[PDB]
Symmetry: D2
Subunit: 259 residues, 4 copies
């Protein structure tokens, strides 16, 4: 029971990877702050956390709004009595060739994926420094944060930027006893990849379905990633056994990118 007496906050917690993370951290002992954008789906996840025997707080928030993130996270931490782990999971993906990326498009993805991570690090680090907590910041990165991919230039740019922020924050926050690491998933099997494939097809002229299949064919381990696969590594990063790890952006990707 690694996380007994701990409090973890997770962004994008209502579904997908963030939900899996929230539930895994709750199973390992933590009370959970669930942040997302739709109250009704958040409330459902909150009940599943409470069913596992933990306390949950479920609040809508815009991770791209610096001051509101800070205040909302502080409200939730006050309600539960602390904060020990911050998982900056929420992000968005875009698909567009380098030549066709437009200004509003790229401003939008940076606002969510880069500023939103930054604002969450700041909100959590502020709270940690208040009680002298040896806190953990855990950011969502990607295989696309280690290598730039075609048609994913904007997304890759934001995940490289999250890696940068991970490193700079690890170095600056170490003297406050706060570690900062990222997790880098591969191909996580979702309806989302069906959407990516569709777009990719219309852009290129390949057959619908072909691109998603070809990507899966590339994974050394021969299967797609589950949200629980990602959650298992986030659980390690949340634990005492990661105390001495900081600044790292670790691939759990089935053998796609090798570092």
């Amino acid at each position: 029971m690694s996380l007994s007496g701990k409090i973890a906050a997770v962004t994008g917690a209502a579904q997908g990877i963030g939900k899996a993370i929230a539930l895994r951290l709750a199973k390992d002992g933590a009370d959970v702050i669930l942040l997302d954008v739709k109250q009704d789906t958040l409330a459902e996840t909150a009940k599943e956390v409470e069913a596992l025997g933990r306390r949950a707080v479920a609040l809508t928030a815009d991770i791209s709004n610096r001051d509101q993130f800070r205040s909302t996270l502080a409200d939730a931490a006050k309600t539960l009595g602390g904060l020990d782990i911050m998982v900056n999971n929420a992000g968005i993906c875009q698909v567009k060739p380098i030549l066709d990326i437009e200004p509003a498009e790229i401003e939008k993805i940076f606002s969510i994926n880069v500023q939103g991570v930054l604002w969450g690090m700041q909100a959590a680090a502020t709270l940690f420094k208040e009680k002298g907590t040896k806190g953990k910041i855990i950011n969502a990165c990607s295989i696309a944060g280690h290598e730039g991919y075609p048609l994913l230039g904007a997304y890759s740019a934001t995940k490289f930027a999250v890696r940068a922020l991970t490193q700079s924050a690890a170095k600056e926050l170490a003297s406050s006893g706060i570690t900062v690491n990222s997790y880098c998933p591969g191909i996580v099997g979702t309806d989302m990849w069906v959407t990516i494939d569709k777009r990719m097809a219309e852009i290129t002229g390949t057959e619908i379905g072909a691109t998603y299949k070809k990507y899966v064919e590339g994974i050394a381990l021969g299967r797609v990633e589950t949200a629980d696969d990602v959650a298992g590594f986030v659980a390690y990063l949340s634990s005492s056994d990661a105390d001495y790890m900081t600044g790292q952006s670790v691939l759990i990707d089935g053998g796609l990118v090798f570092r």
Copy 2:
């Protein structure tokens, strides 16, 4: 005379590294499109190019304005009769601890250093694809694009993002015969580093002068970098001898970051 009959465009060309690049490319044979923000200093650099025996066009431009960059670069290319090399050199630096970075601050540095590079790649690639030119795109990156540094989180984030964009664009533009690479300088000896040191001191309590000295002490080769050091490698990247190199972000840094 590697660049005879070639046309190169350089952003931030009026001074510093961009000026050194412009002059070196002109010495190697190219006619030069000089882009920057002050007409009077641009005009001076233009005259030095013309003194080396080349043609120059010198135009003010805001690299963060997508459509204006495209049209201005096109005007200059029409005036000279082509475009073969695009050097996205201009950028800005900020100094601020991770916890204190503000929304307008980070929007500003991304607009210049990330969007501005993107818009220049798009402007140049459009022109190359018009005549079937085997063009070269060369982006300014940094040691801070390979490792995140303390107090340089925003800057590092933008240079990691430029590396991403370099990779994704190299992969997507290869079939058009266009290569995309970046150069990554170290500590380039300038009044700029005196300013960085000053800020860093006020933030931390170290002595004015101490931080710049300590950084120089770190360079394996034992001397600071000159703008001509950077220009020499940009000259290689502009040449035939770099035809088979694409997607790379190469450190010319005196032995600071090792990849």
Copy 3:
């Protein structure tokens, strides 16, 4: 709990990091095959494992002997009824300037650190494949397998080699259901660094104290690593929460090398 029913083998198990690893895997549920070079100290460690209610086989072996390692590992796996996890921990260190490295010296460290890892990988994967088990190979790498360190040319070369073999093996063995990863510790012992620091001053004219400050006081977390820090991450890599991770060489180094 985490490794209930599993059997693990660990080289260099009698003392040090390897003993910590062995004891942690036993605490987590695994019976252990302890391999090292001195029977008396192996026997002591086996008794600690047995006191946990775990089964232990303790056998002397030379990791650099391909055929002997194969047969000794197979003998132990037969005794215990299987083999799930192979930790290639044992290795040696040498401190010598690049210019002074001699033929017998470099052959010795490659024999132990590179051939020894390869022979272990071969011994364990032969067992996993002949039985059909989904096994895990876990190799000891280092900060020095990610960056070459002064006076550690030979050691760094061997650790880089280990990372290469981790990646090639991960790619080749994935279709047999076998994962291959490495763990990369930072600075555990400090005496070697005093030595290195002195010798760096003598051979390059660095100041005394300055290399030790750079590397030992350069650790972001501000403390040296313990054997338990290392064993904690090895326990993660042994666990089902690492099932989807392959080909990786992960730094648990207190913030020294950033990837």
Copy 4:
């Protein structure tokens, strides 16, 4: 022009990439020390160098013999009146699955590819230091020194080792005014890849054709590399435009490995 007055040594100079390198350095102005294993083909290459109005010394040597390499290089440097540039080009390749690599096999490739590079570095740096020259050591690395490739475990391990020794040597020799870098070609010959592709299918159950497509048709630029591509970058690394570059292992690979 670029290397006027310089003297360079190149191993594997009789044929192939090493002959291209030798001829390019001669064209650029350097007298050349040609080192290889067969006197008759060395003599032919020396005659091509001499036809340029350059001086050549052609001597047989075994790069894996430390003392002999030292004395033969010194003999040649004395004949020509100095030594400025050392290119450690010669190496061998092997294709073998990780599980099947044998002791004499791996010892052979490490002897040639790792010890041979180290002995060359030592032979040249001894000369540079005893005379006080600011020399350049340039080592042959590979895509396989940045990522481990299937069936190329041993070769990849040696090339990773070469990158380590490049970095350690760069750090140790900088204070003597010596730079150390590596060049990392991609895919030049295609026959080896057909072999690898077949053998991958046999050992992992991949489809025939699928490995060759992944690696050979995965080159972004869409064509294999020539010896001239490699020699062009080696010419840059020999030149004063690389003075500030040290510790680097640069990919000229058509867009295969992205760093």
